[PDB]
Amino acid sequence: GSQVFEYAEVDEIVEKRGKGKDVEYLVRWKDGGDCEWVKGVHVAEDVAKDYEDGLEY
Numbered sequence: 001g002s003q004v005f006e007y008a009e010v011d012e013i014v015e016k017r018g019k020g021k022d023v024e025y026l027v028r029w030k031d032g033g034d035c036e037w038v039k040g041v042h043v044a045e046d047v048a049k050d051y052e053d054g055l056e057y
Contacts, residue, residue, distance in 0.1 A: 004055035
């Protein structure tokens, strides 16, 4: 299990997943070793959750 599609957004969220009350989608642009998103609520937390969570489960 890992990156499903290409996953080279390099600008349009690649990853996510966080604390029960803290998630974020923004892990494609720069990154490399780890994730560098900011916030989900701002980056559509409940929109991209289905995007990756299902793909790169």
